[PDB]
Amino acid sequence: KPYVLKFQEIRPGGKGMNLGACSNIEGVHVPAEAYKRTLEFTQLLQRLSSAIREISETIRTLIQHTQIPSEIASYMDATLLDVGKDALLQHISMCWASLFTERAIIHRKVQLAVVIQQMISPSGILFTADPITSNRKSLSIDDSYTVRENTITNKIIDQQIIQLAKLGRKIEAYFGKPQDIEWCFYIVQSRPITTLYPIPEVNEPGNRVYISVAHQQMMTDAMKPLGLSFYLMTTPATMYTAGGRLFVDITQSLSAKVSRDMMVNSLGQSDPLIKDALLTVINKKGFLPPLPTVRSIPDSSSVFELVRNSENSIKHLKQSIETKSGSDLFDFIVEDLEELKRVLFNPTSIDAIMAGMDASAWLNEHIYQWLGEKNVADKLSESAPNNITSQMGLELLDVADVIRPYPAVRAYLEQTKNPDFMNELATLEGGAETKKALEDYLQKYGMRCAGEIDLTKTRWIENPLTLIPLILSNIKNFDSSASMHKFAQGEKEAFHKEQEILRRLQELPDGEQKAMETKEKIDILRHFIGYREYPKYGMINRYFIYKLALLRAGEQLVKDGILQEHEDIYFLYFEELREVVRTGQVDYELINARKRDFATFEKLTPPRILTSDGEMINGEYKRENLPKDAILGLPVSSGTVEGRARVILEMEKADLEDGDILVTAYTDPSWTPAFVSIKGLVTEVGGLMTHGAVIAREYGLPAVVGVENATTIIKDGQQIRINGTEGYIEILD
Ligand SMILES: CCOc1c(C)c(O)c2c(O)c3c(CNN4CCN(C)CC4)cc2c1[C@H](O)O/C=C/[C@H](OC)[C@@H](C)[C@@H](O[C@@H](C)O)[C@@H](C)[C@H](O)[C@@H](C)[C@@H](OP(=O)(O)O)[C@H](C)/C=C/C[C@H](C)C(=O)N3
């Protein structure tokens, strides 16, 4: 190993090369393992393998006590001569001592080296992409300046700064990445920006606009490559991936204008923040290219038969995939996705979904202009029949009803952390009865989980232990038969609402025509609004059957010595994994990079809108006569309540008592069992007719969605008041 080497001489410490590539310096200013012999010293270090932080005490006092054998210093001064020794000592030793306390604070017995350079004077910093919105084209320097390209947007407390903007964008190309170099124009150090949200690799002409799938799907978690792949292979929409999450391209729809006005207005009725964000993008001149100058309603028997038809499709798939392996397995999944798409996007099925959605809109619009009641379809939707997601939440109460009379079982569940607790219940009295209740519940809802759209996430039936805290809370928060009481009560309120509306309408001009037409919509509403949650349920069912088969293939790849861990298939796309099974070869520098990317994706939060310039845009609400200091959101379930806020990001750790108001990032279908005890819901994402929101209505639960940074603005334990009619939130304490 070379004792010493100057910056250009080095070829491919970390800083040792910030210098490395940079020696080139085109158009700008360029400046300018010796502790190997550090080896008394050695005895101490093997004591660290074994608190006693006194150690740093001598390991680090000898550092100052590290005597530099001249064995080479002249070399040291046989190099810096062209450009003292007491100084090298203070820090050379200084740097070594560095190894002593930090490492302890936060490991390998390998080493860091020292870099020597000179001090000069004239300063702020250069950002290649702005930090505020992550726009790759706009840049900002720190006293701070914001320039796009030779134009500055804002001036906040001046011709040479612009000369500068042009220096960063030069060296940016030398690494390709947007970078962070600080100039005081003489730059000492360099490094890339690692906080930016990735732009969807799409090299179709010009500026593009993307819609966040996470917001519509009520799930903001980063998804693994394989899971991302299966969603992309299912959707008919022009969808792409970025930052471990999914986005839909709508740029072409924005080029024409009747296409635009049908896209902007429609998305605005799922959540107003999309529209406000879109209109802002449109108002950005120079970005978006210049514009140039009744559904059918199925029979009553359709829903029953749509469910039956789907169930048997799953049943057939389950039998066919058992005999498949290797390349045959992948060949089968490719042609089964067509069957998935058929059941999921069946014209009759879509008509059944929209039948409930259209009826909700019809009521909410007409009843308001007639009687003055806003969002009456919420209360009319309470305890709607045949909602596979609503049933899931309430039936967990039934599970708790079985366990409650058994003290021996309860003592176990309260303390157990065994994933295989299902097979330890027969020992206890009532465990056999408890096992049955759990197995039956998991036979209906086991294929679901938080993040179910990601095929690679742990399902309930794979880790039943996550359902335990919800079960325990049900035992503590409720008496027996709470499922029947809650549902029956919902039916009463919904019917009393129906009779009230029809009665009041007959007092208006042309009474018994507004009522009869309303009665028709209410029937349609309560007959179809439940089916809304089912196509998702049928899709997830296929996903879990896929997962089990892919795991078998992953385990075969382990047996064949090709894969190390069988869950490493999660970081390969379907297209790639199919080749691994076929050829028998796999690039693990890729797999490790995928894992490395996923770890940074989790630290990212998807914007409502993402552009080609990496700009992250979330819409703004309009405060029309709403209270000031009120946190605005989208009202999706009528009612006003005061309760204790509970900021909970993971359902497994939710210790919900009666009176609590759930504040969280998202509520996908799997969150439903936590709706039974709370008296209000607040989410950061979601829309009018998305997951969670549709369930809150049927549960008679006041909910406000689309509340930005609700898990940060609202503190856990705070008393808050939410209004699910107007869509605002107040802090009281
Ligand atoms: C401009 C927004 O663009 C999107 C986005 C963001 C999407 O996430 C879209 C999307 O996930 C899908 C799909 C599949 N939609 N296809 C489109 C063309 N097909 C012939 C039939 C249906 C599109 C997504 C898009 C969409 O192009 O843009 C508008 C989406 C709207 O969402 C607010 C709207 C169409 C939405 O429903 C509205 C009306 O309430 C769509 C997505 C569905 O009907 C939902 C009801 C959705 O339900 P959910 O996801 O279970 O809550 C449907 C049933 C989902 C089926 C799952 C399937 C795997 C699929 O890929 N669907």
Ligand SMILES: [Cl-]
């Ligand atoms: Cl344990």
